[PDB]
Amino acid sequence: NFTLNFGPQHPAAHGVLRLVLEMNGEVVERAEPHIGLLHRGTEKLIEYKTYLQALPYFDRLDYVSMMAQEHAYSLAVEKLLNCEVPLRAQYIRVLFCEITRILNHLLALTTHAMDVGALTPFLWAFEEREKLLEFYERVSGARMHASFIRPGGVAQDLPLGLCRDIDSFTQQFASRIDELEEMLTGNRIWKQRLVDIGTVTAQQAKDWGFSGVMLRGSGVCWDLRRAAPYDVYDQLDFDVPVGTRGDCYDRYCIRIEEMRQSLRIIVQCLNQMPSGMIKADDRKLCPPSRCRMKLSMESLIHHFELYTEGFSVPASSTYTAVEAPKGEFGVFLVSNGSNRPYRCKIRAPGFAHSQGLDFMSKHHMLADVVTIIGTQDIVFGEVDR
Amino acid sequence: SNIRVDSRGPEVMRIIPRLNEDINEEWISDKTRFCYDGLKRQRLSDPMIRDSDGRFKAVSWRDALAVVGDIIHQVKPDEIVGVAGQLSDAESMMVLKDFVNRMGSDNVWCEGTAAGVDADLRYSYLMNTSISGLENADLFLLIGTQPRV
Amino acid sequence: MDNQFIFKYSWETLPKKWVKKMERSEHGNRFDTNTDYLFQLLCFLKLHTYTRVQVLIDICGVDYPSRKRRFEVVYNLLSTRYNSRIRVQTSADEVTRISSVVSLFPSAGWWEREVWDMFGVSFINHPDLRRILTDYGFEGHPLRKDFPLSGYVQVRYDDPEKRVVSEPIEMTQEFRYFDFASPWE
Amino acid sequence: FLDKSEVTDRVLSVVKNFQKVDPSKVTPKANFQNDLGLDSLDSVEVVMALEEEFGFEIPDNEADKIQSIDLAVDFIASHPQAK
Amino acid sequence: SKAAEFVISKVDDLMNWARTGSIWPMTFGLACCAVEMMHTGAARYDLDRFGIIFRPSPRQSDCMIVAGTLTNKMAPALRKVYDQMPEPRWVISMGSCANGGGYYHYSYSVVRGCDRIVPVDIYVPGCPPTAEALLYGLLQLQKKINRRKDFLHWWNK
Amino acid sequence: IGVPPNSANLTEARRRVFDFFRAACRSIPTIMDIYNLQDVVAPSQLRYAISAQIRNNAHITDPKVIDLLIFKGMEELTDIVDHAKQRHHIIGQYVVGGKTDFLKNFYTSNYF
Amino acid sequence: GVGHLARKGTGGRSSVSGIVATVFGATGFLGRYLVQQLAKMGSQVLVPFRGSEDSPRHLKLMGDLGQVVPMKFDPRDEDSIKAVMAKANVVINLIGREYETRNFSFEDANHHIAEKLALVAKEHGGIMRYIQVSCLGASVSSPSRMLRAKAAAEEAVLNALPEATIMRPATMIGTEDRILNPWSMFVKKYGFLPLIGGGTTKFQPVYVVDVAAAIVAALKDDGSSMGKTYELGGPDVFTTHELAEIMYDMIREWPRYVKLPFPIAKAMAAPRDFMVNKVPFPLPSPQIFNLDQINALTTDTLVSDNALKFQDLDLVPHKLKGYPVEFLIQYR
Amino acid sequence: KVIIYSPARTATQSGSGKLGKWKINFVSTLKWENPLMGWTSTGDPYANVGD
Amino acid sequence: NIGATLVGVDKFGNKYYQKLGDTQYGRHRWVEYASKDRYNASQVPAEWHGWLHFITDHTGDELLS
Ligand SMILES: NC(=O)C1=CN([C@@H]2O[C@H](COP(=O)(O)OP(=O)(O)OC[C@H]3O[C@@H](n4cnc5c(N)ncnc54)[C@H](OP(=O)(O)O)[C@@H]3O)[C@@H](O)[C@H]2O)C=CC1
Ligand SMILES: CCCCCCCCCCCC(=O)SCCNC(=O)CCNC(=O)[C@H](O)C(C)(C)COP(=O)(O)O
Ligand code: SF4
């Protein structure tokens, strides 16, 4: 057999994808992904930054799901600090994590459909993507890399009309999902290009470290929001979709259902969001109000110390994982008692998924490798840090 | 005195004391503290040789060394004099002494106490009582010295 | 199921000569074992009925230049059946080869390659132990504490040579390290 | 089988390219590591040069057995592949 | 010069008009700036409306948008892709990472600016740049193209 | 295949050194074809280069250090066998190559 | 003439040398290497260009940031040359043309521009080192019109500035030379390489990086180079036959020569001589059959046995058989 | 050539928290000034590793 | 520019228009540049920049005072 190279430099398939395929005929016998083209040394750069200074690094890890990584980093810091978060801040964090999950699912589904060849749903989905990036651009100052979720509470409060506009969005997102589903689910070409492609058993998913939609497509009912709940996820009602055959079609159906359930969770968070303050009251770990720093001596001292040295985490180490849209996103944070993290490993779900591309694609057509790659929802910002 | 030089890049910002129970004991003088200003003013940076009219022109290291090495061979061995400064370190003084001795001269000395002082026994030019040992003294007799300056 | 139960059960069931340090806390139940008992411990913890740990979350190294055994290798484990997490740690220096666990957990290959790339720890019986993240021909292991943040070499295009070349690093603005540590900590 | 003349020439010629081997001492019976004071690296380098002047291969268990040029030239003369 | 100052001017204006009206960039998506490029070409901003259509291969593209962190392992491929485009070509650097290394400037495996590998014509600042910021960058590139006088300079030499 | 277990004595280290050297020697013809090194370098200058590297790392007496050196050399050889590294890189590394040193250094810069 | 350099670094890209050079005509073949070697030591280079702004684009990569500053000028205008020369302690001249464009004749492009640059350096006192690059065969008696103009520019620049060094290289070989590349293009387009003199003329080709390094070494001298005329030539004295055979070795093509006597090639290159004038000033530039170049291949051009060479600068030229000609594999 | 030393307490503060740790000083003094913006340039990889 | 209301005029001559939206919006805050020579793509002053980008509801004539 001969040796083949797919390096697509154009972001019509990821952009930094490098597959070295060994093809016998039209089948592929092994897929060896060469990673490292987006290894920017993020893990080492964290050790040279303050805990506050290292927060924006997590925005750029999984750049389709920004709030998910910040939530995990903040939860790890709170665990190592034993910092209590107010209820309103928790509700805001859950609301924006579910908005992020919807954004990631839309981008994944339609970028996967465009690789297959369905050009129309891509722009239809990016319209709603623009609508949600508007909500990110309102609360923070950035459309994508919003350093909104922070270890203490949340960065700053919500503007006046955000709840009303999000409700107006949720009034029609159901019909948007319905149209997108009508374009693809019933189509016979879409079924023929996904059914029985990329089948994985539950044992294989567990052995290879699969998580999220990859794991739940094989019949394993494992959701981190229900097994190890965090924030106010245990006060909200939502179902966990589970696959039956493990192929690429079940992954797509579960990705639709998860986005519908995220809409449901968003509605519940909007309805039940209480009033109160958005940060921990321990000003030794959170910034003072701009009116208090300019009027009180101790508030000014706290502001100075926080924005030069930051807070110091007591010497400990822990692993905290959240249910990122891709799967289980974990942060292994080690602290030596100083103002800078001693070690911070980022456990990316895309790493364990791109590692398993070799066995999912074996004895498959060459044209099925793109579908197998697109069903895993891989971005290389997290695959190689 | 033991100091702690703080710098920001290629320049010295400030000088602060450093603990030494036997020499300075957490204090330094004003001259020590505020001498860092002169390290960046009127600094010689290029080898220079006078011209026919009497002006200094910047010259490479090779040519200046060539000029001095050519002139050093035209003078009698006892005509050579080497004088070390007050800020010189021991290694450079040793090298200067060796260089002047090999040329056939023996006139090497320092800026100040170099008028013919006998350094043959090493108790005649040192504080045989340590500075920290002065705390046990009962009577100080300062013979022609002003330690304040 | 819980940290209070797993701790006691593994205290009783596990052979005593394997584990030499057991922490039971809310940050995580850890096990510290010698490098020659790691594979045995993980095989036991993967097959036992009451400790069915079937998911290896990740493998990470930690650098402690002040220790004799410089590197600490951490195995974060997950049990889906009992909804519990277990962490197992070992210690190795720069010139000892620790046993690989790709036989038990097939996903361990890429994290072991990443650990070798980032810290220089070699794994016995690894099907292919080559660098996975650093550039081709990279010299040195970046995640060590003694490795400079910006590295040793720099990359630029050489027009006469008509190729992208590697040169010794020379920063136009050096990294400014700010010392914010307080004496009253 | 091969005649002794050509194999003797081919083993007497290539050995003088080590920038230290004395041309006066090389002969059909001259041990590599013992008689010439060679190193084990040179002891394997001579065997490698034997497969550097031809395409045949020497297994790892056929290189460390006898470091004698007489047995080496006998083995070369008993190499059907060469000519 | 009775008509050269006129005819050469008009033919050069025609050349510049064609080049500004039909730009075919090659998007070199590398990181989160690729999401902003995809948003720019989507329905809201409609990069197609100005005549810009993206191309997969460098054989048919006259522009090249480097948008993402350029690593040491990826720079040879970047240069190889750049060397394959036809002569009237331009490079647009998008985001802080492509401009000067950005947030990974002091990394051991990051090229501190794509301008060390390829000559850059327009720098679009941001992290990530707004889609309208990329529109402004493409408009600035168009403005620069209109400044070219290829036929007049060819005549003058 | 798998990484060999750590050695126990210097004899095993020497045997692995010889095995790696032979593997590199068998790898010489392949490099001459993957890269256009035919009319560039003699087939023995490279052999001398590997011999010189082994000889200048030959003062090591720790079997673990020798095994790590062999492993790194094998990784470098595998990288060179593949088209991963550029052509001038191996030619930049694998080629064999008056008043006073002090005075030249003095003329160059103050930092020796 | 010491005072034109002050090292402030490790001699790398971000290092600083006290050299601020204005390299005229740096958008050509030799400039691409001279500017690269100047920028490697940390010397700021001003690259004055004319016409399109895309010509100096490839030179921005060579410096770190602000080290290379392209500036437009017009050789006809005198204020532009003064403007692009103000901040400069060193001026290097590379302006020259081997063919004739109706706007700029053989004398204009090779002599008048150099004379104007030397003058402008004279009134603008402050350029410590001035370098003018002529051709090895430059002589008043030379039949080739280009060489005579270069020689006249030599006496002009010496008269205008006695301290100006004259680097006088021979035919250059490199990735973008105009001798090996046109030959290979003719071979790949027509199958045979014509020999204008029958492959008998002898000359000394020099690798271009060696010439650039020689200019750099002359800049970083001990002062002996000032007011000298070096003759830069390669190690081996080749001929049009041997170089063509080496090219066929690199191109991997079966040799096929068509010998052409001097008169027939002279008459076949004649049409472009009396067709310089036409409705368009531009005309397809000659590739191998320049009448001036053919006239230049009538007298053997060798480095003088009694003139300065590479070995007087502590340099050794590359052998033009391996690395120097490896660029020809692109046509293989 | 490196220097192994224990940094001492600063004279402007009475706290003794940043004491007892040992550092390796690489004596990395080769720095200059960028002649475009005045930034401090360096060519030494061990510019701040020990700190 | 048909069925639209002119909000105000700029110092550069730029005219700002507004249209009323109901449920989907579109063409409700735009500028008619007073120039046509490529318009430089950035000629909106600071007082009118906020109104155009929906940052503030003040027109820009009111932002001056
Ligand atoms: N084999 C060779 O190449 C040899 C070269 N030399 C000499 O070396 C020098 C440069 O070498 P090379 O670079 O190879 O030759 P090039 O022709 O490649 O250099 C040409 C340069 O001259 C400039 N130039 C030409 N005419 C004018 C003009 N009328 N006004 C302004 N600028 C002008 C060009 O600018 P533009 O491109 O914008 O016109 C270009 O920058 C020349 O003087 C050449 O004679 C010496 C011996 C042999
Ligand atoms: C193109 C090819 C790519 C790869 C080329 C290779 C690149 C890496 C080269 C390897 C680098 C190393 O250090 S790997 C090899 C390093 N290992 C040793 O040096 C072992 C210590 N040496 C000894 O024991 C003896 O001196 C001995 C020399 C054995 C003989 O002498 P004797 O038997 O009498 O005792
Ligand atoms: S500039 Fe910012 S958004 Fe763009 S690739 Fe770099 S980090 Fe990501």
Side-chain angles (χ1 to χ4, degrees), chain C residues 42 44-48 51-56 77-80 82 84-86 105:
Chain C
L42 270 69
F44 178 94
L45 289 179
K46 190 184 124 69
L47 294 187
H48 188 64
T51 66
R52 283 208 75 79
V53 174
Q54 289 175 172
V55 188
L56 169 67
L77 296 162
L78 172 67
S79 161
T80 308
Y82 299 117
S84 68
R85 290 187 183 274
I86 297 169
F105 307 103

PDB file of all heavy atoms in Angstrom, chain C residues 42 44-48 51-56 77-80 82 84-86 105:
ATOM      1  N   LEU C  42      -2.373  -0.364  38.702  1.00  0.00           N
ATOM      2  CA  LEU C  42      -3.410   0.050  37.762  1.00  0.00           C
ATOM      3  C   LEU C  42      -4.142  -1.141  37.160  1.00  0.00           C
ATOM      4  O   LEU C  42      -5.346  -1.053  36.900  1.00  0.00           O
ATOM      5  CB  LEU C  42      -2.817   0.932  36.665  1.00  0.00           C
ATOM      6  CG  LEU C  42      -2.817   2.432  36.964  1.00  0.00           C
ATOM      7  CD1 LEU C  42      -1.842   2.780  38.064  1.00  0.00           C
ATOM      8  CD2 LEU C  42      -2.499   3.219  35.708  1.00  0.00           C
ATOM      9  N   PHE C  44      -4.716  -3.924  38.796  1.00  0.00           N
ATOM     10  CA  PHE C  44      -5.639  -4.303  39.861  1.00  0.00           C
ATOM     11  C   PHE C  44      -6.840  -3.369  39.904  1.00  0.00           C
ATOM     12  O   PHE C  44      -7.986  -3.821  40.001  1.00  0.00           O
ATOM     13  CB  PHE C  44      -4.916  -4.307  41.207  1.00  0.00           C
ATOM     14  CG  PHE C  44      -5.805  -4.632  42.373  1.00  0.00           C
ATOM     15  CD1 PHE C  44      -5.902  -5.928  42.838  1.00  0.00           C
ATOM     16  CD2 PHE C  44      -6.539  -3.644  43.005  1.00  0.00           C
ATOM     17  CE1 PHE C  44      -6.712  -6.233  43.905  1.00  0.00           C
ATOM     18  CE2 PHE C  44      -7.354  -3.946  44.070  1.00  0.00           C
ATOM     19  CZ  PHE C  44      -7.440  -5.243  44.520  1.00  0.00           C
ATOM     20  N   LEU C  45      -6.598  -2.063  39.837  1.00  0.00           N
ATOM     21  CA  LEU C  45      -7.661  -1.071  39.904  1.00  0.00           C
ATOM     22  C   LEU C  45      -8.497  -1.008  38.636  1.00  0.00           C
ATOM     23  O   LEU C  45      -9.510  -0.308  38.622  1.00  0.00           O
ATOM     24  CB  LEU C  45      -7.074   0.312  40.195  1.00  0.00           C
ATOM     25  CG  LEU C  45      -6.515   0.544  41.599  1.00  0.00           C
ATOM     26  CD1 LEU C  45      -5.943   1.943  41.714  1.00  0.00           C
ATOM     27  CD2 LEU C  45      -7.586   0.319  42.646  1.00  0.00           C
ATOM     28  N   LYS C  46      -8.096  -1.693  37.570  1.00  0.00           N
ATOM     29  CA  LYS C  46      -8.896  -1.739  36.356  1.00  0.00           C
ATOM     30  C   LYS C  46      -9.802  -2.960  36.284  1.00  0.00           C
ATOM     31  O   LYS C  46     -10.797  -2.929  35.553  1.00  0.00           O
ATOM     32  CB  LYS C  46      -7.983  -1.711  35.124  1.00  0.00           C
ATOM     33  CG  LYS C  46      -8.697  -1.510  33.799  1.00  0.00           C
ATOM     34  CD  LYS C  46      -7.725  -1.604  32.639  1.00  0.00           C
ATOM     35  CE  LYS C  46      -8.162  -2.652  31.635  1.00  0.00           C
ATOM     36  NZ  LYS C  46      -9.386  -2.238  30.901  1.00  0.00           N
ATOM     37  N   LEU C  47      -9.500  -4.021  37.033  1.00  0.00           N
ATOM     38  CA  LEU C  47     -10.221  -5.278  36.912  1.00  0.00           C
ATOM     39  C   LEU C  47     -11.049  -5.650  38.132  1.00  0.00           C
ATOM     40  O   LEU C  47     -11.970  -6.460  38.001  1.00  0.00           O
ATOM     41  CB  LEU C  47      -9.243  -6.425  36.622  1.00  0.00           C
ATOM     42  CG  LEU C  47      -8.505  -6.396  35.286  1.00  0.00           C
ATOM     43  CD1 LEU C  47      -7.722  -7.678  35.095  1.00  0.00           C
ATOM     44  CD2 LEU C  47      -9.479  -6.193  34.145  1.00  0.00           C
ATOM     45  N   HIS C  48     -10.750  -5.096  39.303  1.00  0.00           N
ATOM     46  CA  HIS C  48     -11.463  -5.486  40.510  1.00  0.00           C
ATOM     47  C   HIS C  48     -12.917  -5.033  40.451  1.00  0.00           C
ATOM     48  O   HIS C  48     -13.229  -3.966  39.918  1.00  0.00           O
ATOM     49  CB  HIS C  48     -10.781  -4.908  41.745  1.00  0.00           C
ATOM     50  CG  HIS C  48     -11.339  -5.422  43.033  1.00  0.00           C
ATOM     51  ND1 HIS C  48     -11.257  -6.746  43.403  1.00  0.00           N
ATOM     52  CD2 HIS C  48     -11.990  -4.791  44.037  1.00  0.00           C
ATOM     53  CE1 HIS C  48     -11.834  -6.910  44.579  1.00  0.00           C
ATOM     54  NE2 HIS C  48     -12.288  -5.738  44.986  1.00  0.00           N
ATOM     55  N   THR C  51     -13.741  -1.809  42.474  1.00  0.00           N
ATOM     56  CA  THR C  51     -12.941  -0.663  42.062  1.00  0.00           C
ATOM     57  C   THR C  51     -12.779  -0.661  40.553  1.00  0.00           C
ATOM     58  O   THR C  51     -11.668  -0.645  40.027  1.00  0.00           O
ATOM     59  CB  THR C  51     -11.565  -0.648  42.724  1.00  0.00           C
ATOM     60  OG1 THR C  51     -10.798  -1.761  42.252  1.00  0.00           O
ATOM     61  CG2 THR C  51     -11.683  -0.719  44.237  1.00  0.00           C
ATOM     62  N   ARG C  52     -13.893  -0.701  39.828  1.00  0.00           N
ATOM     63  CA  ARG C  52     -13.826  -0.774  38.375  1.00  0.00           C
ATOM     64  C   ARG C  52     -13.452   0.574  37.775  1.00  0.00           C
ATOM     65  O   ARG C  52     -14.326   1.350  37.381  1.00  0.00           O
ATOM     66  CB  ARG C  52     -15.156  -1.254  37.798  1.00  0.00           C
ATOM     67  CG  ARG C  52     -15.382  -2.741  37.942  1.00  0.00           C
ATOM     68  CD  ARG C  52     -16.274  -3.269  36.840  1.00  0.00           C
ATOM     69  NE  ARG C  52     -15.572  -3.361  35.567  1.00  0.00           N
ATOM     70  CZ  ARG C  52     -14.744  -4.342  35.241  1.00  0.00           C
ATOM     71  NH1 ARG C  52     -14.484  -5.333  36.078  1.00  0.00           N
ATOM     72  NH2 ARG C  52     -14.162  -4.330  34.046  1.00  0.00           N
ATOM     73  N   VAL C  53     -12.158   0.857  37.704  1.00  0.00           N
ATOM     74  CA  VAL C  53     -11.642   2.075  37.093  1.00  0.00           C
ATOM     75  C   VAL C  53     -11.292   1.747  35.649  1.00  0.00           C
ATOM     76  O   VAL C  53     -10.289   1.080  35.380  1.00  0.00           O
ATOM     77  CB  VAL C  53     -10.426   2.616  37.852  1.00  0.00           C
ATOM     78  CG1 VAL C  53      -9.840   3.792  37.116  1.00  0.00           C
ATOM     79  CG2 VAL C  53     -10.816   3.009  39.264  1.00  0.00           C
ATOM     80  N   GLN C  54     -12.113   2.218  34.715  1.00  0.00           N
ATOM     81  CA  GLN C  54     -11.968   1.866  33.313  1.00  0.00           C
ATOM     82  C   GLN C  54     -11.615   3.046  32.422  1.00  0.00           C
ATOM     83  O   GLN C  54     -11.481   2.864  31.208  1.00  0.00           O
ATOM     84  CB  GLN C  54     -13.253   1.206  32.805  1.00  0.00           C
ATOM     85  CG  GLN C  54     -13.479  -0.188  33.350  1.00  0.00           C
ATOM     86  CD  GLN C  54     -14.807  -0.770  32.923  1.00  0.00           C
ATOM     87  OE1 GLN C  54     -15.083  -1.947  33.152  1.00  0.00           O
ATOM     88  NE2 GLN C  54     -15.646   0.055  32.309  1.00  0.00           N
ATOM     89  N   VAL C  55     -11.459   4.244  32.977  1.00  0.00           N
ATOM     90  CA  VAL C  55     -11.141   5.430  32.194  1.00  0.00           C
ATOM     91  C   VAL C  55      -9.894   6.071  32.780  1.00  0.00           C
ATOM     92  O   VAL C  55      -9.870   6.419  33.965  1.00  0.00           O
ATOM     93  CB  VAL C  55     -12.302   6.439  32.171  1.00  0.00           C
ATOM     94  CG1 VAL C  55     -12.005   7.560  31.195  1.00  0.00           C
ATOM     95  CG2 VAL C  55     -13.601   5.746  31.808  1.00  0.00           C
ATOM     96  N   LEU C  56      -8.864   6.229  31.955  1.00  0.00           N
ATOM     97  CA  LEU C  56      -7.673   6.989  32.312  1.00  0.00           C
ATOM     98  C   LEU C  56      -7.848   8.394  31.754  1.00  0.00           C
ATOM     99  O   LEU C  56      -7.810   8.593  30.535  1.00  0.00           O
ATOM    100  CB  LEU C  56      -6.410   6.333  31.762  1.00  0.00           C
ATOM    101  CG  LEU C  56      -5.138   7.177  31.855  1.00  0.00           C
ATOM    102  CD1 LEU C  56      -4.729   7.391  33.298  1.00  0.00           C
ATOM    103  CD2 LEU C  56      -4.014   6.542  31.068  1.00  0.00           C
ATOM    104  N   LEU C  77      -7.517   9.053  37.253  1.00  0.00           N
ATOM    105  CA  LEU C  77      -8.344   7.929  36.855  1.00  0.00           C
ATOM    106  C   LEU C  77      -9.802   8.217  37.183  1.00  0.00           C
ATOM    107  O   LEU C  77     -10.115   8.993  38.088  1.00  0.00           O
ATOM    108  CB  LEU C  77      -7.890   6.647  37.558  1.00  0.00           C
ATOM    109  CG  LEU C  77      -6.483   6.156  37.228  1.00  0.00           C
ATOM    110  CD1 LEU C  77      -6.005   5.183  38.284  1.00  0.00           C
ATOM    111  CD2 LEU C  77      -6.465   5.503  35.865  1.00  0.00           C
ATOM    112  N   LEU C  78     -10.696   7.585  36.430  1.00  0.00           N
ATOM    113  CA  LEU C  78     -12.127   7.770  36.609  1.00  0.00           C
ATOM    114  C   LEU C  78     -12.827   6.424  36.543  1.00  0.00           C
ATOM    115  O   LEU C  78     -12.514   5.594  35.687  1.00  0.00           O
ATOM    116  CB  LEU C  78     -12.706   8.712  35.548  1.00  0.00           C
ATOM    117  CG  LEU C  78     -14.227   8.849  35.500  1.00  0.00           C
ATOM    118  CD1 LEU C  78     -14.746   9.526  36.752  1.00  0.00           C
ATOM    119  CD2 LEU C  78     -14.658   9.608  34.262  1.00  0.00           C
ATOM    120  N   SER C  79     -13.776   6.214  37.449  1.00  0.00           N
ATOM    121  CA  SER C  79     -14.608   5.016  37.461  1.00  0.00           C
ATOM    122  C   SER C  79     -16.032   5.432  37.122  1.00  0.00           C
ATOM    123  O   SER C  79     -16.711   6.062  37.938  1.00  0.00           O
ATOM    124  CB  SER C  79     -14.545   4.319  38.816  1.00  0.00           C
ATOM    125  OG  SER C  79     -15.637   3.435  38.978  1.00  0.00           O
ATOM    126  N   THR C  80     -16.479   5.083  35.916  1.00  0.00           N
ATOM    127  CA  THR C  80     -17.828   5.440  35.494  1.00  0.00           C
ATOM    128  C   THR C  80     -18.887   4.670  36.272  1.00  0.00           C
ATOM    129  O   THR C  80     -19.949   5.220  36.580  1.00  0.00           O
ATOM    130  CB  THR C  80     -17.988   5.195  33.994  1.00  0.00           C
ATOM    131  OG1 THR C  80     -16.922   5.840  33.288  1.00  0.00           O
ATOM    132  CG2 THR C  80     -19.310   5.744  33.498  1.00  0.00           C
ATOM    133  N   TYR C  82     -18.922   3.482  39.423  1.00  0.00           N
ATOM    134  CA  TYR C  82     -19.108   3.909  40.800  1.00  0.00           C
ATOM    135  C   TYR C  82     -19.020   5.416  40.981  1.00  0.00           C
ATOM    136  O   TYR C  82     -19.107   5.889  42.118  1.00  0.00           O
ATOM    137  CB  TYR C  82     -18.091   3.211  41.706  1.00  0.00           C
ATOM    138  CG  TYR C  82     -18.235   1.712  41.688  1.00  0.00           C
ATOM    139  CD1 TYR C  82     -17.213   0.902  41.229  1.00  0.00           C
ATOM    140  CD2 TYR C  82     -19.406   1.108  42.113  1.00  0.00           C
ATOM    141  CE1 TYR C  82     -17.349  -0.465  41.203  1.00  0.00           C
ATOM    142  CE2 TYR C  82     -19.551  -0.257  42.089  1.00  0.00           C
ATOM    143  CZ  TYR C  82     -18.519  -1.040  41.635  1.00  0.00           C
ATOM    144  OH  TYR C  82     -18.656  -2.406  41.611  1.00  0.00           O
ATOM    145  N   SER C  84     -16.603   7.711  40.773  1.00  0.00           N
ATOM    146  CA  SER C  84     -15.521   8.113  41.658  1.00  0.00           C
ATOM    147  C   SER C  84     -14.259   8.359  40.847  1.00  0.00           C
ATOM    148  O   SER C  84     -14.077   7.796  39.767  1.00  0.00           O
ATOM    149  CB  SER C  84     -15.251   7.054  42.731  1.00  0.00           C
ATOM    150  OG  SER C  84     -14.716   5.876  42.156  1.00  0.00           O
ATOM    151  N   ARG C  85     -13.386   9.204  41.387  1.00  0.00           N
ATOM    152  CA  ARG C  85     -12.109   9.526  40.771  1.00  0.00           C
ATOM    153  C   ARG C  85     -10.977   9.135  41.708  1.00  0.00           C
ATOM    154  O   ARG C  85     -11.061   9.346  42.921  1.00  0.00           O
ATOM    155  CB  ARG C  85     -12.010  11.014  40.436  1.00  0.00           C
ATOM    156  CG  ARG C  85     -12.908  11.450  39.301  1.00  0.00           C
ATOM    157  CD  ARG C  85     -12.645  12.886  38.909  1.00  0.00           C
ATOM    158  NE  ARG C  85     -13.560  13.330  37.865  1.00  0.00           N
ATOM    159  CZ  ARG C  85     -13.352  13.159  36.569  1.00  0.00           C
ATOM    160  NH1 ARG C  85     -12.259  12.572  36.116  1.00  0.00           N
ATOM    161  NH2 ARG C  85     -14.264  13.590  35.704  1.00  0.00           N
ATOM    162  N   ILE C  86      -9.921   8.565  41.138  1.00  0.00           N
ATOM    163  CA  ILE C  86      -8.744   8.146  41.885  1.00  0.00           C
ATOM    164  C   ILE C  86      -7.518   8.725  41.197  1.00  0.00           C
ATOM    165  O   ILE C  86      -7.436   8.734  39.965  1.00  0.00           O
ATOM    166  CB  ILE C  86      -8.647   6.609  41.978  1.00  0.00           C
ATOM    167  CG1 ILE C  86      -9.841   6.046  42.747  1.00  0.00           C
ATOM    168  CG2 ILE C  86      -7.361   6.189  42.659  1.00  0.00           C
ATOM    169  CD1 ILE C  86      -9.962   4.542  42.665  1.00  0.00           C
ATOM    170  N   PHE C 105      -4.677   0.733  29.368  1.00  0.00           N
ATOM    171  CA  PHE C 105      -5.473   1.807  28.786  1.00  0.00           C
ATOM    172  C   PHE C 105      -4.886   2.191  27.439  1.00  0.00           C
ATOM    173  O   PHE C 105      -3.802   2.789  27.393  1.00  0.00           O
ATOM    174  CB  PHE C 105      -5.505   3.017  29.718  1.00  0.00           C
ATOM    175  CG  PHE C 105      -5.931   2.690  31.113  1.00  0.00           C
ATOM    176  CD1 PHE C 105      -4.998   2.607  32.128  1.00  0.00           C
ATOM    177  CD2 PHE C 105      -7.262   2.459  31.411  1.00  0.00           C
ATOM    178  CE1 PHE C 105      -5.383   2.303  33.413  1.00  0.00           C
ATOM    179  CE2 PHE C 105      -7.652   2.156  32.697  1.00  0.00           C
ATOM    180  CZ  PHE C 105      -6.713   2.077  33.699  1.00  0.00           C
TER     181      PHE C 105
END
